From TrEMBL, chain C:
Subcellular location: Mitochondrion
One Gene Ontology term, aspect cellular component: large ribosomal subunit
Record protein name field: Large ribosomal subunit protein uL22m
Similarity comment: Belongs to the universal ribosomal protein uL22 family.
Any one GO molecular-function label of the UniProt entry: structural constituent of ribosome
Residues of the full protein shown: 47 to 212 of 212
Keywords: Mitochondrion, Ribonucleoprotein, Ribosomal protein, Transit peptide
Length: 152, 108, 166, 148, 287, 304
RNA sequence: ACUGAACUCCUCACACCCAAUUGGACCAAUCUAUCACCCUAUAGAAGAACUAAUGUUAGUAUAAGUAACAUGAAAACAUUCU
């Protein structure tokens, strides 16, 4: 039974899980876009947003600094978090990362996912887009919307 | 615990040709509007993604070239400029990445 | 070994009379000595048996099995040669008529067990065979209706005779 | 066994003995060797018995081939279009004469299991049994427990 | 009798098609360059008047055959089964495109014509039914409509809910028939010969010939039913999935004659709506 | 090809459609607030032997409750959410012993329901409901479909039966499933700690039907009998039932009158068909308490 | 009263239902003498016939696509991290 269990069991155990996620997160901070197995990415996603929140909390803050020091193995990334990533997202209250499923891995046929920090410099992903408003169904519904607003 | 008797081809066929064993037909397959190659819905188009990844790799090679050695992550934002492009007011005070090719249509 | 499937494309039919329906083009193609189990290959062969060429290619493209890409390659080769050599009008206007796996020539190796004892390991090889036929894929056989069953049962009753009599 | 073998009903070719009896055997081909011990009996048959058989059965055409062969054969053809090949290899004159006469007597119908030892196209004269035979009619044709 | 009229119309249509087919200069070849985002710069070397855009799709893939609704030939809308005439640039238009306006119009017109066919065959022999036209009403309006003149006998008659259901069932039967949308490009005289009986059709053909520099008009056939169209149509009847005949309204200026406007709403297989959304579209289309 | 509702909708059409359908649901629910103003089915007085309809409630959770005697009783909170009568079936039509009322609870999405269910609810003029349960009633207890049901249907001091699917524990071994003692830890016991012992007897060359073996436990319907109603909260439609009911929190439970022979004919004081708020005779307070219940806001109890 | 066998009768036929053992009539294929010449004849010979030896060798099944086996992470694939 695993009712209300929120964390996956991965790696060689709890510490190993932390270390695996830490490496993925370090990769994400450096590269701003990471391919990895879907489950591992999904697990890391939460930590990614939390890290930005601690980044926002301030450079001078000792608590935030300690957290940043732990989660970023490469130390050059710690300035980047506080001075680049945190100021970028100052406007929005969340939804810093974007996760999309990728065609399965060649070797082991693993479910794969791309994770990026929003507003990166890199070429945009081929994101899924909803149908145009000018489609037949959308036209009919626009007609309906117009009729309803005219009624009021 | 060993088999008491050889299982026949009739019984074996029944086991291994069961619908449960069979491969299921997929209804997720649609044409990617951008390239015309087949994509599974809910999944990024393989062709389009490969294209984006190739460009990303090239930019990253250039990033590494400009940085020089490890532990040289900039403390400023980055922008990528292609041939016949100049930094704007926004692009001023950002790290400039130069590419030897033209702007892709999809890159905006 | 036998290689009859190859010789099937070498058949030449006499020219058709004007007052005759157009003969659908048949294409025979196989890959020999695929490093893959025939049993595993069978599932993929069965999958695409009734399908059109494009449907089959789509299904194979998004399959996770090793043999899927091999069948995809064979199908593409067959589609190409169909148009080029066998005078098929449209590359899309093809459907899989036959799709089969057969055993290949195999190699015996030794598998070491956890005493002096051992086992004989067999390196599996298989052939994939395909026949493509020009035209739309034939419609699947409709499920038997209540009226069809009823008719069949009446027919059974009407068929019966007084047995062991004059 | 029956389950392992085809079966047929008892039949005639064209209602053979109804109007007039017509001999079903049509042609009889013999392959005989001039030299060869197998065809010894066959030779003696051709010498003495075949002429008389031909006279007795004018409807049958007899062919005698007389060619080199290890086994002599008789091929019997019937009006229905059946062909029967019978080996007369190392058989006496008596045995061959017997076999040939049997072929003359036989029709072209297959020698398989015959399902019924009788066949009729009009089995009934008074009318085949149905449930309502041997049942009395009722007034107004009223069903049981019917008010009207 | 209606049967003899449709028979005669079919004979004339077939005769005209045969005439147009006969003047082909022995399977001439045309070069058709595909200009699209997908599979760029592919050329089709195809028959001058035998070949169609659908056969171009058949050269590419099944996906093109399935999804393509119209062909844009030299930037002009073109039926999938309409034969090509000259060396040209082709692209395929689907419902999913950024601006599917042309596809929307084509689908709308096609459904209008289908409804026309249905309502023609629907009424009894004793009653007289005369089809006026299919107005070019926008998709945003919510209902494709057709104008019909009925006999004086059914002036006081108003269709019931069951009657509308019956029209719907007939339309679904027509969908199930899976009939191609046959097209013909003719001189006015031929159209006049075909549509000599219906004065409304006469008038409509006259104005259509007038707007064109020549006297060239377009005709479309589903199955034993012929109608003159405003523009290009969808390839096949099977494209429609959800098809209901919404309502019938009497037009207000009924001084000379009484015209019924038949209104209905449709969506293709590609753009299937949920039961709930569909119910909203129905309740709007009745207005 | 597979399709969902918002597959083919635009960016701006999705919020519009959501709003439109939500508003229609709200309107339909609000429409049914006055059943007595609409043409009702005849209301009959209570008779011995009569059985009334029950409810479908959502299990909110548990809190402690105290009594004047000083004993603490844990109670379960059952919230009644959009509970309506859906269908009536006569005894002859049902081919059963009693007339039946189908009652639904907890409104759900229209987009996620089958066409058949959608059509049925469309005819009703109510948004679709998660679960429908059937209550066997007498003819005199018949209620017109569409009529809302409230927590005040039950009254404090009354006993109820509660039926729900139990918490699914998935595949379980004999020790957790049937409380088998298992085998000792040490003193040998090579591979036997949690295993079933002898499954059957030697002489029978088989295993009896219904032997206790490892399998799926939970996720089945169970009934808790003779649970006391301690308190009703009329404002939020809460029933406070004694002890624990089956199922997880936020599940849907079937609540009916107790079938136990002790509480056979205690339905005299209860509102017979149902409670109709629109009647508006002696408007009920926010909270209905049992005599023994220590009400919040009451002075501290002294055992005199 | 009737049913009821391989008993008995009936139409035709007849060597044609015991272990070990014993007597007899035939005979597959091969080689040789002499025949024969789309595959045989009369004789003489003999490594002269396999549903069975946990038989020998080889092939291929069953158990079974089972048991089991394998590559720390990201990435510019420079490198860095655990
Ligand atoms: Mg879980
Ligand atoms: Mg693991
Ligand atoms: Mg060793
Ligand atoms: Mg213990
Ligand atoms: Mg142990
Ligand atoms: Mg041990
Ligand atoms: Mg007897
Ligand atoms: Mg006997
Ligand atoms: Mg006897
Ligand atoms: Mg005897
Ligand atoms: Mg021997
Ligand atoms: Mg043997
Ligand atoms: Mg042996
Ligand atoms: Mg097993
Ligand atoms: Mg394992
Ligand atoms: Zn793409």
């Amino acid at each position: 039974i695993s009712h209300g269990r929120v964390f996956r069991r991965m790696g060689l155990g709890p510490e190993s899980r932390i270390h695996l996620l830490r490496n993925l997160l370090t990769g994400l901070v450096r590269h701003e876009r990471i391919e990895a197995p879907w489950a591992r990415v999904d697990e890391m996603r939460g930590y990614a947003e939390k890290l930005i929140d601690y980044g926002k909390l301030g450079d001078t803050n000792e608590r935030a600094m300690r957290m940043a020091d732990f989660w970023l193995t490469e130390k050059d990334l710690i300035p980047k978090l506080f001075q680049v990533l945190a100021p970028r997202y100052k406007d929005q209250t969340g939804g810093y990362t974007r996760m999309l499923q990728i065609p399965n891995r060649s070797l082991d046929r693993a479910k794969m996912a791309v994770i990026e920090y929003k507003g990166n410099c890199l070429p945009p992903l081929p994101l899924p887009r909803r149908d145009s408003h000018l489609t037949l169904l959308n036209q009919l519904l626009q007609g309906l919307r117009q009729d309803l607003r005219q009624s009021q | 615990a060993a088999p008491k008797n050889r299982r026949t081809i009739e019984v074996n066929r029944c086991r291994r040709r069961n619908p449960q064993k069979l491969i299921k037909v997929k209804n997720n397959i649609d044409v990617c509007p951008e390239c015309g190659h087949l994509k599974q819905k809910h999944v990024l188009c393989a062709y389009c993604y490969e294209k984006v990844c190739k460009e990303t790799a090239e930019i990253r090679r250039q990033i590494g070239k400009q940085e020089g050695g490890p532990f040289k992550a900039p403390t400023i934002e980055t922008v990528v400029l292609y041939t016949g492009e100049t930094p704007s007011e926004q692009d001023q005070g950002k790290r400039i990445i130069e590419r030897d090719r033209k702007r892709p249509s999809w890159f905006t | 070994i036998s290689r009859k499937w190859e010789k099937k494309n070498k058949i030449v039919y006499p020219p058709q009379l004007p007052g005759e329906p157009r003969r659908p083009a048949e294409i025979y193609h196989c890959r020999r000595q695929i490093k893959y189990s025939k049993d595993k290959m069978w599932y993929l062969a069965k999958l695409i048996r009734g399908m059109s060429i494009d449907q089959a290619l789509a299904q194979l493209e998004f399959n996770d099995k090793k043999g899927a890409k091999i069948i995809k390659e064979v199908l593409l080769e067959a589609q190409d040669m169909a148009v080029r050599d066998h005078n098929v009008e449209f590359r899309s206007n093809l459907y899989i008529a036959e799709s089969t796996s057969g055993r290949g020539q195999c190699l015996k190796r030794i598998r070491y067990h956890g005493r002096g004892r051992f086992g004989i390991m067999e390196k599996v090889y298989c052939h994939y065979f395909v026949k493509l036929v020009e035209g739309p894929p034939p419609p699947p056989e409709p499920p038997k209706t209540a009226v069809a069953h009823a008719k069949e049962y009446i027919q059974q009753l009407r068929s019966r005779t007084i047995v062991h009599t004059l | 066994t029956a389950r392992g073998t085809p079966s047929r009903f008892l039949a005639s070719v064209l209602h053979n003995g109804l109007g007039r009896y017509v001999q079903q055997l049509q042609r009889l081909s013999f392959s005989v060797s001039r030299d060869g011990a197998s065809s010894r009996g066959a030779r003696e048959f051709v010498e003495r018995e075949v002429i008389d058989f031909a006279r007795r059965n004018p409807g049958v055409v007899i062919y005698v081939n007389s060619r080199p062969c290890c086994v002599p054969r008789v091929v019997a053809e019937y009006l229905n279009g059946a062909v029967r090949e019978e080996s007369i290899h190392c058989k006496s004159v008596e045995e061959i004469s017997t076999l040939v006469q049997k072929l003359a007597d036989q029709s072209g119908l297959d020698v398989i299991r015959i399902r019924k030892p009788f066949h009729t196209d009009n089995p009934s004269i008074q009318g085949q049994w149905h449930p309502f035979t041997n049942k009395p009619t009722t007034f107004r044709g009223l069903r049981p427990r019917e008010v009207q | 009798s209606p049967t003899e009229l449709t028979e005669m119309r079919n004979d004339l249509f077939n005769k005209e098609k045969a005439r147009q087919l006969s003047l082909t200069p022995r399977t001439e070849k045309i070069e058709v360059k595909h200009v699209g985002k997908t599979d760029p710069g592919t050329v089709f070397v195809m028959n001058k008047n035998i070949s169609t855009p659908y056969s171009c799709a058949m050269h590419l893939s099944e996906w093109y055959c399935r999804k393509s609704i119209l062909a844009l030939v030299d930037g002009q809308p073109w039926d999938m089964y309409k034969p090509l005439t000259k060396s040209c640039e082709i692209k395929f238009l689907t419902f999913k495109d950024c601006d599917p306006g042309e596809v929307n119009k084509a689908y709308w017109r096609s459904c209008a014509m289908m409804m026309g066919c249905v309502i023609e065959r629907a009424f009894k022999d004793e009653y007289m039914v005369n089809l006026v036209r299919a107005p070019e009403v926008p998709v945003i309006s919510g209902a494709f409509c057709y104008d019909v003149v009925l006999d004086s006998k059914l002036d006081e008659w108003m269709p019931t809910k069951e009657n509308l259901r019956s029209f719907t069932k007939d339309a679904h039967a027509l969908i199930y028939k899976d009939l191609p949308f046959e097209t013909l490009e003719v001189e006015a005289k031929v159209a006049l010969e075909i549509f000599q009986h219906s004065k409304y059709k006469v008038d409509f053909i006259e104005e259509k010939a007038s707007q064109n520099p020549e006297r060239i008009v377009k005709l479309h056939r589903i199955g034993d039913f012929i109608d003159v169209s405003e523009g290009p149509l969808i390839p096949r009847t099977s494209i429609c999935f959800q098809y209901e005949v919404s309502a019938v309204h009497n037009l207000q200026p009924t001084q000379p004659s009484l015209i019924r406007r038949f209104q209905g709403v449709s969506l293709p297989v590609h753009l299937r709506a949920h039961f709930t959304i569909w119910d909203k579209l129905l309740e709007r289309s009745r207005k | 090809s597979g399709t969902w509702w918002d597959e083919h909708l635009s960016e701006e059409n999705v919020p519009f459609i959501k709003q439109l359908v939500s508003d229609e649901d709200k309107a339909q629910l609000a429409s049914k607030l006055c059943p007595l103003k609409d043409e009702p089915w005849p209301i009959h007085p209570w008779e011995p032997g009569s059985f009334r309809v029950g409810l479908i409630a959502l299990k909110l959770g548990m809190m402690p409750l105290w009594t004047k005697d000083g004993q603490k009783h844990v109670v379960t909170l059952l919230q009644v959410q959009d509970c309506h009568v859906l269908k009536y079936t006569s005894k002859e039509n049902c081919n059963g012993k009693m007339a039946t009322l189908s009652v639904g609870g907890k409104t759900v999405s229209r987009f996620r329901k089958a066409t058949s269910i959608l059509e049925f609810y469309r005819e009703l003029g109510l948004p679709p409901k998660q679960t429908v349960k059937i209550f066997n009633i007498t003819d005199n207890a018949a209620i017109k479909p569409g009529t809302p049901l409230y927590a005040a249907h039950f009254r404090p001091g009354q006993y109820v039966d509660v039926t729900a699917k139990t918490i699914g524990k998935g595949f379980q071994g004999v020790m957790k499933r049937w409380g088998f003692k298992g085998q000792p830890a040490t003193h040998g016991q090579t591979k036997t700690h949690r295993r079933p012992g002898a499954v059957a007897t030697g002489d029978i060359g088989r295993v009896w039907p219904g032997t206790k073996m490892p399998g799926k436990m939970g996720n089945i319907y169970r009934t808790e009998y003779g649970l006391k109603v301690w308190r009703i909260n009329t404002k939020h439609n809460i029933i406070y039932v004694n002890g624990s009911v089956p199922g997880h929190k936020n599940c849907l439970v079937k609540v009916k009158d107790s079938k136990l022979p002790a509480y056979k004919d205690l339905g005299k004081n209860l509102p017979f068909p149902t409670y109709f708020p629109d009647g508006d005779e002696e408007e009920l307070p926010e909270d209905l308490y049992d005599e023994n219940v220590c009400q919040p806001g009451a002075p501290s109890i002294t055992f005199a």
